[PDB]
């Protein structure tokens, strides 16, 4: 009657920008100390894009989740049209000679679409911009797998609390995975600089003003709004106002 342990699920902090590497260091160590039994995942929370280039040079970094979408961009000879939908890229049309055509869809980091006569390719790869500075890990953590974390290469070590790895849910895990990979990510923004809003919270509720500048980064605004006839620039969050 075999019973496994549960492993958990930890939160490694990294050097930021090298996360990619944080978790290829990860699983060389992970092999050379022996210690693979012990870790069921090493995630990198970050999305997945196409990045579409054209002789050496990105013309295109576009999310692989979406709307079906056709991109052309000009070669070396003339234009190759990438499709991407359902999660996958591939090639609808190319030059004559391009056999890249019949290259199977593309969907996972590391793969890639090349055209040899037209020099453009479309390669997945993971973004970072979410959570930068994170590699997510599932396993049965010790003192010989600590220490062998602190000591990968580009890892400092696990968010600790208390002096322990702090084990994290499986549900927000999941969650905040599913979000990251499979959520939509709107058409557009919601406000646009110009646009006249009402504010529905806070001190300045019943107040209008004007969009001044957007930042969809934190869903924050700068909103022109008249205070005894002085315009006067508040910082508002999205769900703060309403178009009017």
């Given at each position: 009657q075999v019973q496994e342990l549960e492993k958990k699920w930890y939160a490694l902090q990294v050097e930021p920008g090298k996360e990619n590497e944080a978790k290829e260091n990860l699983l060389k160590v992970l092999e050379l100390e022996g210690l693979?039994?012990?870790?069921?995942e090493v995630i990198v929370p970050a999305e997945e894009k196409v990045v579409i280039r054209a002789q050496g040079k990105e013309k295109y970094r576009l999310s692989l989740k979406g709307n079906a979408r056709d991109i052309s961009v000009l070669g070396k000879k003339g234009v190759t049209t990438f499709r991407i939908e359902n999660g996958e890229v591939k090639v609808v049309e190319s030059v004559?000679?391009?056999?890249?055509?019949?290259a199977p869809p593309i969907s996972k980091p590391g793969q890639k679409i090349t055209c040899k006569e037209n020099k453009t390719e479309a390669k997945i790869v993971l973004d970072?911009?979410?959570?930068?500075?994170y590699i997510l890990i599932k396993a049965h953590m010790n003192d010989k797998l600590l220490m062998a974390i602190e000591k990968t290469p580009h890892v400092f070590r696990p968010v600790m609390v208390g002096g322990k790895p702090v084990p994290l849910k499986e549900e927000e895990v999941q969650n905040i995975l599913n979000q990251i990979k499979r959520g939509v990510k709107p058409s557009k923004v919601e406000f646009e600089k110009g646009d006249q809003v009402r504010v529905?919270?806070?001190?300045?509720?019943?107040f209008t003003g004007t969009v001044e500048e957007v930042h969809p980064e934190k869903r924050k605004l700068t909103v022109m709004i008249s205070i005894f006839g002085r315009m006067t620039p508040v910082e508002l969050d999205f769900d703060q106002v309403e178009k009017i």
């Amino acid at each position: 009657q075999v019973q496994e342990l549960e492993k958990k699920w930890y939160a490694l902090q990294v050097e930021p920008g090298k996360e990619n590497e944080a978790k290829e260091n990860l699983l060389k160590v992970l092999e050379l100390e022996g210690l693979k039994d012990l870790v069921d995942e090493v995630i990198v929370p970050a999305e997945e894009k196409v990045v579409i280039r054209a002789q050496g040079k990105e013309k295109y970094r576009l999310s692989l989740k979406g709307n079906a979408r056709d991109i052309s961009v000009l070669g070396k000879k003339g234009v190759t049209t990438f499709r991407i939908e359902n999660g996958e890229v591939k090639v609808v049309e190319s030059v004559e000679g391009d056999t890249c055509v019949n290259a199977p869809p593309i969907s996972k980091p590391g793969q890639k679409i090349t055209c040899k006569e037209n020099k453009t390719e479309a390669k997945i790869v993971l973004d970072n911009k979410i959570f930068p500075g994170y590699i997510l890990i599932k396993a049965h953590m010790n003192d010989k797998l600590l220490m062998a974390i602190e000591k990968t290469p580009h890892v400092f070590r696990p968010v600790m609390v208390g002096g322990k790895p702090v084990p994290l849910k499986e549900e927000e895990v999941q969650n905040i995975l599913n979000q990251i990979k499979r959520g939509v990510k709107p058409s557009k923004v919601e406000f646009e600089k110009g646009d006249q809003v009402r504010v529905i919270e806070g001190p300045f509720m019943n107040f209008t003003g004007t969009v001044e500048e957007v930042h969809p980064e934190k869903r924050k605004l700068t909103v022109m709004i008249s205070i005894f006839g002085r315009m006067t620039p508040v910082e508002l969050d999205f769900d703060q106002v309403e178009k009017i």
